[PDB]
Amino acid sequence: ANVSIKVAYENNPGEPFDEVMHYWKDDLAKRSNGEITLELYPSSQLGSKKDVTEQAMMGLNVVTISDVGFLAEYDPDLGVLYGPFLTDDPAQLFKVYDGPWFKEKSEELKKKGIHIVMPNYLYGIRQIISKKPIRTPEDLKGMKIRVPNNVMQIKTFEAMGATPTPMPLGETFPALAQGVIDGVENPISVLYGQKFQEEAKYLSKVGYLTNVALIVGGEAFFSTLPEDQLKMIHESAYDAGLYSQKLTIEKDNEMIEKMKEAGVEIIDVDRAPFKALAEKVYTQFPEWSPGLYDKIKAELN
Ligand SMILES: C[C@H](O)[C@@H](O)[C@@H](O)[C@H](O)C(=O)O
Ligand SMILES: [Cl-]
Ligand SMILES: [Cl-]
Numbered sequence: 001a002n003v004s005i006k007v008a009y010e011n012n013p014g015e016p017f018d019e020v021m022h023y024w025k026d027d028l029a030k031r032s033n034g035e036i037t038l039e040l041y042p043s044s045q046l047g048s049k050k051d052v053t054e055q056a057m058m059g060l061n062v063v064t065i066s067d068v069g070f071l072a073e074y075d076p077d078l079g080v081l082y083g084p085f086l087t088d089d090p091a092q093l094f095k096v097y098d099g100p101w102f103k104e105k106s107e108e109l110k111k112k113g114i115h116i117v118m119p120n121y122l123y124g125i126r127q128i129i130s131k132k133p134i135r136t137p138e139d140l141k142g143m144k145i146r147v148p149n150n151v152m153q154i155k156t157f158e159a160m161g162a163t164p165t166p167m168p169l170g171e172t173f174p175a176l177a178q179g180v181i182d183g184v185e186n187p188i189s190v191l192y193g194q195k196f197q198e199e200a201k202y203l204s205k206v207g208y209l210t211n212v213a214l215i216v217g218g219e220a221f222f223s224t225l226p227e228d229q230l231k232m233i234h235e236s237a238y239d240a241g242l243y244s245q246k247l248t249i250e251k252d253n254e255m256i257e258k259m260k261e262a263g264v265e266i267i268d269v270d271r272a273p274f275k276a277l278a279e280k281v282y283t284q285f286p287e288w289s290p291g292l293y294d295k296i297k298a299e300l301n
Helices: 016-031 049-057 076-082 090-097 100-111 151-160 169-178 188-193 227-250 252-261 272-283 292-300
Strands: 003-008 036-041 062-066 114-130 144-147 163-166 183-187 202-218 265-267
Touching (some): 003 016, 016 036, 016 114, 016 188, 016 227, 036 227, 049 062, 049 114, 049 202, 076 100, 076 292, 090 292, 100 292, 114 227, 144 169, 151 163, 151 272, 183 188, 202 272, 252 265
Parallel strands (some): 003 062, 144 163
Antiparallel strands (some): 062 202, 114 183, 114 202
């Protein structure tokens, strides 16, 4: 039987993320002999991440890119895994995603209506592009940095001294052009693909978040599918995640040079003072289970 699945994301056509969605679509199409078809909706065509997630939860045949910081809204302990400067090594992160605590969380989420489809996308390392250079935390004072509607990211930027300004990625460009905000934070490929270099000419390599992304949909939808189809969807999704773990990194030199050609200065910074301020967020979540952060660090190594 033919199954169509809408795939919603904020990234624009040609971004590495969009390329990996094409990989996934082709992989799944081939495994299923054309019976399972992904319909791609880049550039926030289906609206905001939080809204798309709600539609999925009611049973719409849609998935969206997301992360554990968003999912913390539904399962609070997941928030710790989106914390700043957790590690610079993707391999360590993926140990937690592959471990039994994350499995338990993923099963909890199903009962809440949320089905993780792809658990292993390497989104990149999040940097900041801004209208004035950020070399020290002191430079962030007075700056309105856009962040997603993600509690951990909001608290992270507050702890470092900025004024976080949350909004969906699809609204960010005009806010930056108008000076409502004066910076944006994201992996360099996403910053470039969203054209923020037209409005901001300083890129600081704070590297505050080594970023894993998830594809998520609604359990009410996925539980209706036969086992053989679910297997093809999960396997092809995992393949795509593995592809992202090569492509995202491979794209680095190319993206650095494109930024330079657009007149953006790439700034290496002393990361330690940013990290020292950001680390305070780990004691700002009273709803976390006791010992959560310690357990996470123990699993990372
Ligand atoms: C995987 C993440 O949720 C991204 O989709 C999100 O950070 C996005 O790049 C944004 O900046 O809103
Ligand atoms: Cl949102
Ligand atoms: Cl958002």
